[PDB]
Design a protein around this nucleic acid. Structure first.
Lengths: 106, 84, 156, 175
RNA sequence: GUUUGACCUCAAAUCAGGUAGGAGUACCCGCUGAAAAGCGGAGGAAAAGAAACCAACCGGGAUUGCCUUAGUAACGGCGAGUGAAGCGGCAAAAGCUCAAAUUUGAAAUCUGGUACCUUCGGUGCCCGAGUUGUAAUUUGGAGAGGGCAACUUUGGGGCCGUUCCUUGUCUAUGUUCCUUGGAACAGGACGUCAUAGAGGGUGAGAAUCCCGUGUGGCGAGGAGUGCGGUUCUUUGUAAAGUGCCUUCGAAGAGUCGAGUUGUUUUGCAGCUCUAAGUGGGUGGUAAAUUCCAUCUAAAGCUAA
RNA sequence: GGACCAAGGAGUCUAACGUCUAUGCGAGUGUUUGGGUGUAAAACCCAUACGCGUAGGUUGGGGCCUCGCAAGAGGUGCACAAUCGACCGAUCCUGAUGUCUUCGGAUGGAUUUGAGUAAGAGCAUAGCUGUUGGGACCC
């Protein structure tokens, strides 16, 4: 037996985390740059979704290295495979738009 | 929704065997000699044929395709030794 | 307050090691850039304050509803009835070139290049197959790169 | 699934298995002498259908027991019965008869040539593999979700297209 | 040479330096286990955790936890009832390190002692450890050697702020008249403050009596690299990254697996047997002498 | 079953189905896992998912209309009921046009069938209650 009495409280604490982390990460977003990825499982195969990370080859197609891209806040998954054209292209456009909107301090 | 061909990632284990590792394994083979059931197994080939040899080897092993490879390996040993 | 420890610590002459924290955990300093530390407000939120900056606070797809906060009046459809600033400051700061230093050359190896420059001159196929003063057997073009850097540094 | 086949020869049949029952429960409640000669009970024609006739033949060759069986000097009244119900062979085991054995509901799938590889010669279309049943379940669920999403779209349309305009004579119309 | 010495092993040290135990034990992790108890081991969390994964799709992508899946699948004298998981939505997000081929143009590595120094350390010197392998480089997402073309990059301190902690101090307005009362903090009349009318005390219900409360301010002592300025230096043929070309291009065995026994509801354990390298694991698939999918086990760490 | 007296002292809570009633919306309904917000365990706003549901005639007959001063007459007929239908699914025969020699169901029958079609009613919350289980009124 357990009752979530702290449901109101923990959220507050969580936003405190979402405050406090943000304090350290002051210009940058809290979250990384995640891929837009179409789901499996025919019930959901029309659904698109947030994915974990893009790939090496896609980040190369964006025009940078993944080792550098992790410093730019772009989530990268090696074990994913890019197999759909439109997914790949839309995520490349996403990467380009993310590159357009950042300004990086030396 | 139309196509895109990924570059197929094959593990380096699945590529091939090198000259180095074949040399290593074959050089271990003559040094290690035969285990006693292998000493039995060459004699059992020479005496009662590969039928009973494969059956005894599968009894020593767990499965059957390993017994194939074991009998074929001892045939390779007999071919390497007796003619040469 | 019914453990033996808590009751003894209550009755003790030591006094409770009491520290107050609950007020100061809500407020945070941003610690990182003095520009954002200037424009930070401590009143709006992380979310509202990043929006008032112009920086995208969360990357993508917030769960829940944002504040559309009544910027405009929305009127009913008749259905055809019958008859930046701080962004600019940080953009200047990232656009600001840092005072960088050219990577120079070390004195021994530029002297080595100076020996090569007088021994062979400028040609590279002779100095590539030189034993003395090319004992590390430098690459054909690394020689060119180091000599061009040395010439731009000294001696045209 | 199982195959039973003559390993130098053309016969090869694939049967599906349903509804097993074991020796553990009271459904048996008796043991018999392991090695008695079996009797069969072909509770079906097995004659008019040539492939069922081959099934009956190969079950005779399979389940026929030569006298090299140990403990065969006793006959333990052992009998097994085969019954095509619709196209499913119910197989039962008796020892007056008491069910002393495991229980089958068995289903033909396909017949092919050779010893394990040779070309497919017969197949009953009446069998459905249960993977296809799960696939039907998932496809129907995906169709339901698609219809539910389209209906939610049309509900938001109708909510947008549900608004009735004000009268020209109202206070909000004036002001 | 009956001598002498390398080792190697094993002892001894009131030799030097360290460390183990016990308590507590809500949470965690192992072991044992009835009709829980017990044992062992930790921490502020622990565990788990970067696929020998899940799937069959227009594929997904470490672990963890929540909602849903769902009281479904499945199991069960299919009786009692037992009882999941994929996907989805969310929270949180982070990835890394070994072991395989030579640095052989120089073991480049480290403990310890000592002398100094700016001391959670640094430098020097000397014993040792170590080739029965300590460093650099490389963990498949490859990588390495070169070569070409370019570009692109540099590290270490200080100090002062800032940030964090622990404190210290300052920061409003009636004790105005009358009645009652032992005592006004009660009742009436007239007020003032307020970003302060929370609370408590003061001889009865006190914003205005006191402490506070509220708003801000000034300190003090630490922690600290989080960043922000200054300031001092840092190169030595030093280190790294990207594209192209050329030449190569090595990985977890008493393990995998098999049988049996116990145990659990398929793993685990014991006993016996015991492999492969275009290998192996796992799953669908068949118009069938099938094709295709998907990972790399038997080494390790990792916040939330 | 009892010396007296004071105090304490026995159908509570929760879960799953079920009826009824009230309320909101309505073929839809359900904010509160979670996010945003806040004067801060309150209130306020809500993205994507998910849950559950959705996807003919005759006789009457409430009324209503007409006429009738009224009594009554005529007409249209809510709900619902009965009949005769129809159709779908099943049922057992017919077994065509075709037919790979065993495939096929065309047409016509027959009874019942079914919370069947023939123009929805549900979802959510609360209350009172029914059954079951948790110690389950107490000893």
């Amino acid at each position: 037996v357990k009752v979530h009495f702290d449901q109101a409280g923990k959220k507050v604490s969580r936003r405190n985390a979402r405050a406090t982390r943000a304090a350290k990460i002051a210009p940058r977003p809290l979250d990384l740059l995640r891929p837009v990825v179409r789901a499996p499982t025919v019930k959901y195969n029309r659904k698109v979704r947030a994915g974990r990370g893009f790939t090496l080859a896609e980040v190369k197609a964006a025009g940078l290295t993944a080792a550098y891209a992790r410093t730019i806040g772009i989530a990268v998954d090696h074990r994913r495979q890019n197999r759909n054209q439109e997914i790949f292209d839309a995520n490349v456009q996403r990467l380009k738009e993310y590159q357009s909107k950042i300004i990086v301090f030396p | 929704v139309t196509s895109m061909t990924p570059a197929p990632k094959i593990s380096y284990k699945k590529g091939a065997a090198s000259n180095r590792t074949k040399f290593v394994r074959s050089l271990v083979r003559e040094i290690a000699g035969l285990s006693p059931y292998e000493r039995r197994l060459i004699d059992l080939i020479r005496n009662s044929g590969e039928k009973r040899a494969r059956k005894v080897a599968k009894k020593r092993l767990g499965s059957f395709t390993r017994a194939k490879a074991k009998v074929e390996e001892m045939n390779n040993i007999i071919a390497a030794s007796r003619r040469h | 307050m019914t453990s033996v420890r808590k009751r003894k610590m209550n009755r003790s002459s030591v006094g409770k090691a009491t520290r107050r924290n609950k007020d100061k955990q809500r407020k945070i300093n941003i610690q990182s850039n003095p520009i954002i530390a200037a424009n930070w407000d401590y009143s709006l939120t992380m979310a509202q304050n990043y929006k008032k900056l112009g920086l995208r606070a969360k990357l993508q797809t917030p769960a829940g509803g944002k504040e559309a906060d009544l910027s405009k009046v929305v009127k009913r459809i008749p259905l055809t009835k019958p008859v930046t600033e701080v962004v600019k400051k940080l953009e200047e700061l990232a656009s600001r070139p840092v005072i960088r230093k050219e990577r120079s050359q070390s004195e021994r190896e530029e002297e080595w290049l100076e020996k090569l420059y007088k021994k062979h001159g400028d040609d590279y196929k002779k100095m590539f197959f030189d034993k003395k003063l090319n004992i590390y057997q430098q690459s054909e073009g690394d020689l060119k790169r180091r000599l061009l850097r040395w010439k731009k540094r000294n001696g045209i | 699934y199982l195959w039973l086949s003559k390993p130098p020869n053309g016969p090869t049949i694939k049967f599906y298995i349903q509804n097993l029952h074991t020796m553990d429960e009271x459904x048996x409640x008796x043991x018999x002498x392991x090695g008695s000669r079996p009797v069969l009970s072909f509770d079906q024609r097995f004659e008019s259908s040539p492939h069922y006739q081959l099934i009956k033949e190969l079950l005779v060759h399979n389940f026929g027991v030569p006298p090299x069986x140990x403990x065969x000097x006793x006959x333990x009244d052992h009998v097994m019965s085969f019954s095509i119900v619709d196209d499913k062979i119910w197989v039962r085991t008796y020892e007056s008869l008491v069910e002393i054995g495991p229980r089958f509901v068995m289903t033909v799938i396909l017949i092919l040539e050779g010893s394990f590889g040779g070309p497919k010669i017969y197949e009953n279309k009446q069998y459905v593999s249960p993977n296809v049943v799960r696939a039907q379940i998932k496809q129907q669920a995906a169709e339901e979700a698609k219809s539910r999403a389209e209906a939610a779209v049309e509900r938001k349309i109708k909510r947008r297209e549900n608004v009735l305009a004000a009268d020209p004579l109202s206070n909000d119309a004036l002001f």
